[PDB]
Amino acid sequence: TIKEMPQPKTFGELKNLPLLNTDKPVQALMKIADELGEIFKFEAPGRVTRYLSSQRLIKEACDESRFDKNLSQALKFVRDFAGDGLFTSWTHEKNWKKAHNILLPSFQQAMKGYHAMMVDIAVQLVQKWERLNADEHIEVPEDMTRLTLDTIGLCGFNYRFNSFYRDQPHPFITSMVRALDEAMNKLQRANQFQEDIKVMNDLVDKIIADRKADDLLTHMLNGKDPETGEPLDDENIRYQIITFLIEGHETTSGLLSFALYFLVKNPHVLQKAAEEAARVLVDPVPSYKQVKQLKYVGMVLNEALRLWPTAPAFSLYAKEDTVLGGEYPLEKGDELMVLIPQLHRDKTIWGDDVEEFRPERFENPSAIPQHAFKPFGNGQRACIGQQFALHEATLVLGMMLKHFDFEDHTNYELDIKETLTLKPEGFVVKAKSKKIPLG
Numbered sequence: 001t002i003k004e005m006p007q008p009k010t011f012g013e014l015k016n017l018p019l020l021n022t023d024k025p026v027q028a029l030m031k032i033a034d035e036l037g038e039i040f041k042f043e044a045p046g047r048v049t050r051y052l053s054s055q056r057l058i059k060e061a062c063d064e065s066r067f068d069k070n071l072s073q074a075l076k077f078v079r080d081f082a083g084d085g086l087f088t089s090w091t092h093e094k095n096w097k098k099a100h101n102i103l104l105p106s107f108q109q110a111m112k113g114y115h116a117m118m119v120d121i122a123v124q125l126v127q128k129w130e131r132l133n134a135d136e137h138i139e140v141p142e143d144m145t146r147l148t149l150d151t152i153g154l155c156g157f158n159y160r161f162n163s164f165y166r167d168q169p170h171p172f173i174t175s176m177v178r179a180l181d182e183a184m185n186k187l188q189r190a191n192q193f194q195e196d197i198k199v200m201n202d203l204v205d206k207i208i209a210d211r212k213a214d215d216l217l218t219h220m221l222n223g224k225d226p227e228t229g230e231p232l233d234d235e236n237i238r239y240q241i242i243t244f245l246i247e248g249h250e251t252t253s254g255l256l257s258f259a260l261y262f263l264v265k266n267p268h269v270l271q272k273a274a275e276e277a278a279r280v281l282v283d284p285v286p287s288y289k290q291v292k293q294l295k296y297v298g299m300v301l302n303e304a305l306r307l308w309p310t311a312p313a314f315s316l317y318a319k320e321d322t323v324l325g326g327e328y329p330l331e332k333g334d335e336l337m338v339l340i341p342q343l344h345r346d347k348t349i350w351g352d353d354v355e356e357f358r359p360e361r362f363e364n365p366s367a368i369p370q371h372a373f374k375p376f377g378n379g380q381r382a383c384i385g386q387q388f389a390l391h392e393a394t395l396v397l398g399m400m401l402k403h404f405d406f407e408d409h410t411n412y413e414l415d416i417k418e419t420l421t422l423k424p425e426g427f428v429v430k431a432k433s434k435k436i437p438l439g
């Protein structure tokens, strides 16, 4: 028939809330999913969502004729600062489709155009590590953030954040992390955020004052949509700046940190990746063409996104009354949340060793089922920056693996911090230079 949907214990008016009393709500939900399976309902005072974990259900939810992108409480909390820019706009808001057509050509060909500036920041990362004394170590996510922020600032906006000239995190990041944490904390509330938003806006004006006195910024200021013919308004443009400075770097830093984490934890995987880097990256600096030949480095990165997709959930709503999976009636407006780390652990797809780090799972991707691997979201609301993220990550990891041997000197225990994105907090390593000349 039509089944009761599983649901964890409720606690009077508190609903299911006392079950997410944590700074790590996604990891908590993954445990509820392990217990209750492919679908469960979750209620907090005033609001209700349904968490999906199977490819069979997610495949249905990904049917855009039936479900569209929802702004979850977390993205509503975020719309305050990025407005109706691409990430926090509803698909039916005019600026969504409009920015999408106006911005999409900036993301392979734009990539060729971005390569050199990606290499500029990546060489700054390598030089930093080459210059460390023997007694020193690397703070991995902290340096990855320095890299990915500087990369978007330069490739997107021709602005230099100069992150590597500071040994504290950039002033822009510190607000960012506190605003993301606060949006996440706000979630477990039954009943500085202005300061952090103002500090972000503060930087946007710097950028805006800069071009004033061929890249993303160009297309934001000058580009017009081949439908309505209308350009972006200034309000929206400020909104797209803020948007690309966050999503533009946080998830990719997380990815590169998880990737190095898994490599040091899997020395045979590391060996094979380093072997490819050396034979492929024969020039002083890498070319666009060489980065494209780093087949096993891309498999490594995809397998890190499989385990810990760094933007770990996306939210959908029923466009109309519908039945999910031939069993679960939903009313127009009902929220579904896709738990991507749980999707990537669906044993009917992946086999029964879902926790192991095996890049060879991606050896021939043209044989992974559709909707089984979704680290970049779904459909027309999928990550516009997918190829940019991947090219950057593959370039940088490739250069890292060419130029150094890595040591897990603290025997680091994975600790994943959640700011509605994921990163391995406190991950540190030592890197011994192979003493290989740069350009």
Ligand code: HEM
Residues within 6 Å of the ligand: 069, 086, 087, 100, 152, 243, 244, 247, 248, 249, 251, 252, 255, 305, 309, 310, 311, 313, 314, 315, 374, 375, 376, 377, 378, 380, 381, 382, 383, 384, 385, 386, 388, 389, 390
């Ligand atoms: C590994 C790195 C990345 C991951 C895992 C990731 C993940 C995602 C996911 C899952 C979504 C869908 C959000 C939702 O459905 O609510 C998304 C959307 C988006 N992402 Fe990414 N992202 C990454 C890198 C980037 C980069 C480098 C950029 C920009 C340069 C970026 C820009 C965006 C934008 C603008 C959107 C909204 C797209 C739209 O709705 O039109 N992402 N991303």
